Write a protein that binds this ligand. Structure first.
Ligand SMILES: [Mg+2]
Ligand SMILES: [Mg+2]
Ligand SMILES: [Mg+2]
Ligand SMILES: [Mg+2]
Ligand SMILES: [Mg+2]
Ligand SMILES: [Mg+2]
Ligand SMILES: [Mg+2]
Ligand SMILES: [Mg+2]
Ligand SMILES: [Mg+2]
Ligand SMILES: [Mg+2]
Ligand SMILES: [Mg+2]
Ligand SMILES: [Mg+2]
Ligand SMILES: [Mg+2]
Ligand SMILES: [Mg+2]
Ligand SMILES: [Mg+2]
Ligand SMILES: [Mg+2]
Ligand SMILES: [Mg+2]
Ligand SMILES: [Mg+2]
Ligand SMILES: [Mg+2]
Ligand SMILES: [Mg+2]
Ligand SMILES: [Mg+2]
Ligand SMILES: [Mg+2]
Ligand SMILES: [Mg+2]
Ligand SMILES: [Mg+2]
Ligand SMILES: [Mg+2]
Ligand SMILES: [Mg+2]
Ligand SMILES: [Mg+2]
Ligand SMILES: [Mg+2]
Ligand SMILES: [Mg+2]
Ligand SMILES: [Mg+2]
Ligand SMILES: [Mg+2]
Ligand SMILES: [Mg+2]
Ligand SMILES: [Mg+2]
Ligand SMILES: [Mg+2]
Ligand SMILES: [Mg+2]
Ligand SMILES: [Mg+2]
Ligand SMILES: [Mg+2]
Ligand SMILES: [Mg+2]
Ligand SMILES: [Mg+2]
Ligand SMILES: [Mg+2]
Ligand SMILES: [Mg+2]
Lengths: 112, 137, 52, 117, 101
RNA sequence: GGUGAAAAGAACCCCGGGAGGGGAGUGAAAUAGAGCCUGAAACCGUGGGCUUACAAGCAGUCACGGCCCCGCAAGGGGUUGU
RNA sequence: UCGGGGCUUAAGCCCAGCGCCGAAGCUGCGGGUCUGGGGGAUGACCCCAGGCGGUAGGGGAGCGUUCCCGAUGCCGAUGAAG
C-alpha cells in the first residue's frame, strides 16, 4: 500500500528545503533517518519531522511494517509568501518575500 | 508515393592519383561520397560509396599553382593568419592538399562532415587492404 | 542598478542549467564499532564513547 | 446595458495556445509569443507547399540521371530522347522505375536512344 | 502487372486490385470507369506515341469525399494584414479491378 | 463580499514543542474543512513517454526515418535524427 | 578568399549550334468567390467564359458579447452557467 504525511505552511524557502528532500527520495526509512540526521541544513529538521510522522501513519493507521518501508515519493510545494517592506537607501523601499513550504513524504512497503 | 531505400551497404572504391588534375579528380570523388550516382539517391541519409585514394603525393595541377596557390589558416590570436603555399603542402603533409579540396566540395552540415570521414587518402599506395577495393578511373 | 544590469530575463532553461551543480551529497557515515548506530568517521558521538 | 469582457477573450487566447503546443519555451505558453510564432508558421507552410513541388522536381531528376548514366547516357539527353519520341509518360516521378522495375528503364533508354539519332 | 495511368492531371503506377484515391471525378458512387489513358505494362509496352494505342484499365469508384482541412495562413508584417482560410480538397477513391488492355 | 440545505465546525486515537497532518466521524458532496462555491492564466513542483554532450540559432515549416501510445484495419497522436 | 572549393586545347574570353535545368509566370486536374451571358415559367440549381497582390481609404456580407420582446412559455437535479 502507501501512507503519506504533509507539513503545510513551513516558514522556509522551498528552493532550500527541496535540496534536502531530493537527498532522500526513494531511499529506505532507516537510510533517510540517518541521512537527515547528519545532513547540514536547516531544512533537514523539517523534512525529518514530516518523515517521522509519515512512518507513524504507515504503522498506526495502515498496518504496514516499519522494518521495511521507504520513501516511495516526496516533494515540496510553495505556499503563500509573507511579504515585508525594507527601507533602502535614498528613501526607496523594497518588498522582500519570506517564502513558505508544503512538505510531503509518501511511504510504501518494501516488497511483496 | 516516392521510394525510400533501406539499410544499404558500403560499396568501397579505390582511386589512383598520379597525373590526375587536383580539382577535376576532386569533383568525381565528391559525387561518390554522396550517392548522386546511385539511383536510390537519398539526401538525408548518406550512402555514398567509401573512397580510398593513393599516391596523392603525385597529383598534377596547372598554372603555377605550386607557388601561386597558397592555403590560409587562421588561429584565434592576433596575426594568427598563416599562409602555406602548395609547394610546401605536398613537400610536407601531401594527402592534406587532396583533402582541402574534396572537403571544400562536400555539403556543410553534420552529414557533410560524416561524408568526409568516408574518405581515405594516402601517399603510397599500400593502404590498409581491408576488403573491397574495386579500382576505378 | 548603477551601471551594469541583466540585458534579458534568464530563461527557465538556462536558469535550471546553472543549477546543475547545486545538488547536495549524503553525509559520509560508518557503523561505530562500540555501538550499532552510525557515526561520521574520525568523530566521537553520543549514545557511545571511546577507549582511553 | 454593460457587456463586460466575460469569457470571450480567454477562449480566443486558449484557442491559439492549442495551435501553438509543442513550440519551444514561451512560444507555447505565452499567448503573445504564441501568436507571433504561429504567424510565421502559417507563412512557412504556405511557402513550403509550393516548395515541395520543387523538392521532388529535383529528387527524381537526380535519381533518374543517376541510373540513366549507368546506360552511358545523361539525363539532359535522356529527356531529349523521350520527348523526341513523344513518350510523354514517365512523369519524372514515375521514373522511380530506375529503382524498382529496372528493365523497363533500360527499355525506355533504348527507345530514347533510337529516337534521338 | 505494372501499369502507368493518367488521371486528374497526375500519373500513377497501378496493380491489379489496389485501393487508391485520385482527383475528384464526376461518376456514380459505384460505377466502373476505364482510365482509357494508359502507358506501359509489367511486360514492356512503352507508349511510343503519347498513349497506349489500344488498351485501358478498369476501376470501380469506391465513393467520394473531402480531405483533411489545411489552414492556409497569410501574414504581411508591418502592415496589419492577416488572412485565414480552411481548405479541404475533394477526392474520389478508386478500386483498381482489371488491367485488361 | 460567498463553508453547507443545516455547524452537523470534525469527539476520540496516532506523529509533532506547536503548526500541520494520518485515521475515526458529520455531510448529497470535505479536491464544500473554515478568508472554506465555482477555481481560469502566468509561475513552482513530482512521475511517465520521446529526445540531447562534433554542435551554428526569430527556434519554425516541409520531407523522410526511429522510438512510445491509440484502433482488427487503411489510419491517427506524441516526440525529433538528418 | 573570384559566394567557397577549385578551374589553364578552361570550369577564362570571343564566334557558331543542339540539348536540358530553372518562378507562386503559362498548361493539366479538382475547388472557392465575384462578375457577365445562357437554360431554368421555377426560387433552388445547372452550364460556359472572365476577374480575384495590396498600405491610406471607399463599399458589401457575416461572427460573438450584454440586455428587451418571443416568457404565466421552453430546457434544467436523468445536472444550468462557467
Ligand atoms: Mg598572383
Ligand atoms: Mg539541420
Ligand atoms: Mg540548420
Ligand atoms: Mg472591454
Ligand atoms: Mg518581415
Ligand atoms: Mg515592421
Ligand atoms: Mg459558522
Ligand atoms: Mg484530524
Ligand atoms: Mg517551548
Ligand atoms: Mg490540529
Ligand atoms: Mg479521513
Ligand atoms: Mg457518508
Ligand atoms: Mg456530482
Ligand atoms: Mg470522503
Ligand atoms: Mg473540484
Ligand atoms: Mg465544492
Ligand atoms: Mg487559508
Ligand atoms: Mg486561497
Ligand atoms: Mg451554492
Ligand atoms: Mg494551474
Ligand atoms: Mg519531468
Ligand atoms: Mg536514448
Ligand atoms: Mg544543433
Ligand atoms: Mg549557419
Ligand atoms: Mg511505453
Ligand atoms: Mg484496427
Ligand atoms: Mg524538427
Ligand atoms: Mg566560382
Ligand atoms: Mg573550343
Ligand atoms: Mg449569374
Ligand atoms: Mg428571377
Ligand atoms: Mg491575378
Ligand atoms: Mg483583394
Ligand atoms: Mg478610398
Ligand atoms: Mg448582419
Ligand atoms: Mg412557445
Ligand atoms: Mg423539466
Ligand atoms: Mg440529485
Ligand atoms: Mg439524459
Ligand atoms: Mg456530473
Ligand atoms: Mg448570462
Amino acid at each position: 500500500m502507501e501512507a503519506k504525511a504533509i507539513a503545510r505552511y513551513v516558514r522556509i524557502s522551498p528552493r532550500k528545503v527541496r535540496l534536502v528532500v531530493d537527498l532522500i527520495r526513494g531511499k529506505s526509512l532507516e537510510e533517510a533517518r540517518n541521512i537527515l540526521r547528519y545532513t547540514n541544513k536547516r531544512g533537514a529538521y523539517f523534512v525529518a519531522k514530516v518523515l517521522e510522522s509519515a512512518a507513524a501513519n504507515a504503522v498506526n493507521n495502515h498496518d504496514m511494517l516499519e522494518d521495511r518501508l521507504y520513501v516511495k515519493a516526496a516533494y515540496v510545494d510553495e505556499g503563500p509568501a509573507l511579504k515585508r517592506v525594507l527601507p533602502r537607501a535614498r528613501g526607496r523601499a523594497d518588498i522582500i518575500k519570506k517564502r513558505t513550504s508544503h512538505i510531503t513524504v509518501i511511504l510504501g512497503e518494501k516488497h511483496g | 508515393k516516392t521510394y525510400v531505400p533501406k539499410q544499404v551497404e558500403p560499396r568501397w572504391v579505390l582511386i589512383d592519383a598520379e597525373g590526375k588534375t587536383l580539382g577535376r579528380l576532386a569533383t568525381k570523388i565528391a559525387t561518390l561520397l554522396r550517392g548522386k550516382h546511385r539511383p536510390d539517391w537519398t539526401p538525408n541519409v548518406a550512402m555514398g560509396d567509401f573512397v580510398v585514394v593513393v599516391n596523392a603525393d603525385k597529383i598534377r595541377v596547372t598554372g603555377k599553382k605550386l607557388e601561386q596557390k597558397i592555403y590560409t589558416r587562421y588561429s584565434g590570436y592576433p596575426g594568427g593568419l598563416k599562409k602555406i603555399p602548395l609547394e610546401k603542402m605536398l613537400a610536407t603533409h601531401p594527402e592534406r592538399v587532396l583533402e582541402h579540396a574534396v572537403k571544400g566540395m562536400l555539403p556543410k552540415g553534420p552529414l557533410g562532415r560524416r561524408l568526409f570521414k568516408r574518405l581515405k587518402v594516402y601517399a603510397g599506395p599500400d593502404h590498409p587492404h581491408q576488403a573491397q577495393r574495386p579500382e576505378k578511373l | 542598478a548603477k551601471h551594469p544590469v541583466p540585458k534579458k530575463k534568464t530563461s527557465k532553461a538556462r536558469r535550471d542549467a546553472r543549477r546543475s551543480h547545486h545538488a547536495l551529497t549524503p553525509p559520509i557515515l560508518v557503523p561505530c564499532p562500540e555501538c550499532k548506530a552510525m557515526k561520521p568517521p574520525h568523530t566521537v558521538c553520543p549514545e557511545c564513547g571511546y577507549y582511553a | 446595458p454593460r457587456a463586460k469582457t466575460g469569457v470571450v477573450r480567454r477562449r480566443k487566447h486558449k484557442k491559439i495556445l492549442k495551435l501553438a503546443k509543442g513550440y519551444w519555451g514561451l512560444r507555447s505558453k505565452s499567448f503573445r509569443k504564441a501568436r507571433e510564432t504561429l504567424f510565421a508558421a502559417g507563412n512557412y507552410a504556405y511557402a513550403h507547399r509550393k516548395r515541395r513541388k520543387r523538392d521532388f522536381r529535383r529528387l527524381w531528376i537526380v535519381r533518374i540521371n543517376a541510373a540513366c548514366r549507368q546506360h552511358g547516357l545523361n539525363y539532359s539527353t535522356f529527356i531529349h530522347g523521350l520527348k523526341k519520341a513523344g513518350i510523354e509518360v514517365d512523369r519524372k516521378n514515375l521514373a522511380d522505375l530506375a529503382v524498382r522495375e529496372p528493365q523497363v528503364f533500360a527499355e525506355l533508354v533504348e527507345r530514347a536512344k533510337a529516337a534521338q539519332g | 502487372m505494372f501499369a502507368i495511368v493518367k488521371t486528374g492531371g497526375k500519373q500513377y503506377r497501378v496493380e491489379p486490385g489496389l485501393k487508391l484515391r485520385v482527383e475528384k471525378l464526376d461518376a456514380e458512387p459505384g460505377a466502373t470507369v476505364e482510365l482509357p489513358v494508359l502507358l506501359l505494362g509489367g511486360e514492356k509496352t512503352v507508349v511510343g506515341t503519347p498513349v497506349v494505342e489500344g488498351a485501358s484499365v478498369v476501376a470501380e469508384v469506391l465513393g467520394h469525399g473531402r480531405g483533411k482541412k489545411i489552414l492556409v495562413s497569410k501574414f504581411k508584417a508591418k502592415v496589419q494584414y492577416r488572412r485565414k482560410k480552411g481548405h479541404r480538397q475533394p477526392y474520389t477513391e478508386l478500386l483498381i479491378k482489371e488491367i485488361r488492355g
